Amino acid sequence: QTALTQPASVSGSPGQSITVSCTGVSSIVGSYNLVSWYQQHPGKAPKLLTYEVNKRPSGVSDRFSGSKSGNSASLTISGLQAEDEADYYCSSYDGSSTSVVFGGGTKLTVLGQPKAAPSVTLFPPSSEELQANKATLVCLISDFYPGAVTVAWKADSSPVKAGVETTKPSKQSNNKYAASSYLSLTPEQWKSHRSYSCQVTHEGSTVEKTVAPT
Amino acid sequence: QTALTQPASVSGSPGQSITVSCTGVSSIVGSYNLVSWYQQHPGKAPKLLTYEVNKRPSGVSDRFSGSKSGNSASLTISGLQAEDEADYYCSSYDGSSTSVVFGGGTKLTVLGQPKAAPSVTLFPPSSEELQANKATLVCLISDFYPGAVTVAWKADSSPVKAGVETTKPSKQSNNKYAASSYLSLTPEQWKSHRSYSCQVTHEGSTVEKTVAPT
């Protein structure tokens, strides 16, 4: 199909400014300065950032400004913040008699955010769960960055190679990631060992937490 | 109130047909018949399925058809295929901002296995954690399908607001989903209450677990 031309991706560090161009914008009939830019975060609907080239709806920071020059429009984001990491789209009320054309989209990555070691919290099975004749251990891994992490389990000092489920890291409200790994055991397995351990490896450093029956 | 409103999610089996609704089109000034539906697969730009209510662009199967009756517009998909699982957005041209406005999105799941309700295990704060002035509660939500849930916390009948984080559902090895919601609090407020409840709502049905200091 037809789309406005945008670069596929752009990146910058916090505090910097990024300009995203959108070409093919010139209308074919009336001088349409009807260019709008949208921001889209994963799993959410596109949000309007600017319209009629440079107007901002209420609630949108003035760090976002649009402009237009000939067959091209631009969106500049001043003072880049981690929350700006998202996809951006321009759109134009094209010469296609009563028709709107959209851009292919630009993915903005905010580089250079500080590394954060993960907080690791290990939970032993609850009394409630033991009474249902089941035992689950959960290793909660939070506030880390970058979002890649390796998780391993030990029963005493030996590797546990079955019953381990680890979720994919997801960004949370503070722009850092969280994930959890759980190990399902029988109550007999849990009591037949002196301790279990969750080892988390993040950017070369490994942290280990241990828990014992009580 | 959103200008356009649609169900958050719907699911259907392969072979059937389902209809996704969108309300609010008549109150958008200057919308006339500029109603479009977009389909969006993860990591990709939205793809136009229908425009001007019922026209289809080149390459869109005739399994997709749109309709508008008053303040509602609808997208009907017949002969559901696995590849139709995606997010669907209705939208409309808004004369007030000379821009396209989007509905909130509808996540459509094509049921590839039976619907599975979630196992919910709630964990109270680990001892070595309170020992260091932190009190995290973890609500583990596993083995559910489709992959979407809402989670609510209650600190003694009173809805909990701040300090809640829930991860985006992740597909595990058995092909079902898992997620966790943790609540961060101070040991003080942990003991300042009698019970804590984790309420998980999935496909209209809601389960609740509770823990109490001990």
Side-chain angles (χ1 to χ4, degrees), chain B residues 77-148:
Chain B
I77 299 158
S78 64
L80 231 32
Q81 279 175 27
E83 40 263 63
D84 296 323
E85 175 161 281
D87 290 313
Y88 292 77
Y89 295 98
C90 56
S91 68
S92 164
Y93 180 70
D94 182 343
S96 93
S97 72
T98 68
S99 297
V100 158
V101 173
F102 290 85
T106 300
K107 179 51 179 165
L108 171 78
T109 301
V110 177
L111 302 170
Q113 64 186 284
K115 289 186 184 191
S119 290
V120 179
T121 317
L122 183 53
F123 296 79
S126 51
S127 54
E128 89 145 50
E129 175 174 56
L130 289 158
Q131 181 60 29
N133 247 75
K134 274 150 42 236
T136 312
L137 287 108
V138 191
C139 188
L140 177 65
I141 308 140
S142 53
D143 296 306
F144 53 97
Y145 184 75

Side-chain angles (χ1 to χ4, degrees), chain B residues 170-207:
Chain B
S170 166
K171 195 211 296 311
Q172 292 318 123
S173 73
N174 63 351
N175 289 308
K176 293 184 185 177
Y177 287 90
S180 30
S181 175
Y182 53 103
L183 174 51
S184 281
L185 24 116
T186 49
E188 297 83 66
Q189 67 208 192
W190 155 232
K191 284 163 187 305
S192 304
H193 296 68
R194 86 187 56 225
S195 107
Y196 272 108
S197 59
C198 175
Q199 309 202 262
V200 171
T201 299
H202 172 80
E203 302 289 275
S205 210
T206 92
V207 310

Side-chain angles (χ1 to χ4, degrees), chain A residues 78-97:
Chain A
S78 296
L80 217 46
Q81 291 164 204
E83 316 83 63
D84 299 329
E85 199 165 78
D87 289 331
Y88 295 82
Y89 295 92
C90 52
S91 73
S92 181
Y93 216 63
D94 199 21
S96 219
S97 289

Side-chain angles (χ1 to χ4, degrees), chain A residues 96-200:
Chain A
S96 219
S97 289
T98 303
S99 198
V100 65
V101 49
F102 269 80
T106 299
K107 186 181 182 198
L108 184 161
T109 296
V110 173
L111 299 173
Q113 303 182 54
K115 298 281 169 181
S119 294
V120 185
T121 313
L122 186 56
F123 303 70
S126 47
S127 275
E128 287 279 305
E129 215 203 343
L130 292 176
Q131 298 178 325
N133 206 45
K134 71 200 330 305
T136 306
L137 298 163
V138 48
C139 190
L140 182 75
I141 304 116
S142 70
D143 310 309
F144 55 101
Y145 187 100
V149 95
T150 279
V151 183
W153 291 82
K154 279 148 73 183
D156 288 313
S157 66
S158 302
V160 173
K161 261 57 181 294
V164 178
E165 285 306 326
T166 301
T167 68
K168 316 299 163 302
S170 68
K171 207 136 93 64
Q172 295 307 129
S173 87
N174 65 351
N175 306 312
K176 267 112 114 176
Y177 296 76
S180 64
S181 188
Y182 55 99
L183 173 57
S184 298
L185 307 174
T186 63
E188 296 68 55
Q189 297 192 295
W190 160 242
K191 299 198 91 54
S192 84
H193 277 107
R194 287 179 204 244
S195 66
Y196 270 77
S197 301
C198 175
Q199 302 198 321
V200 180

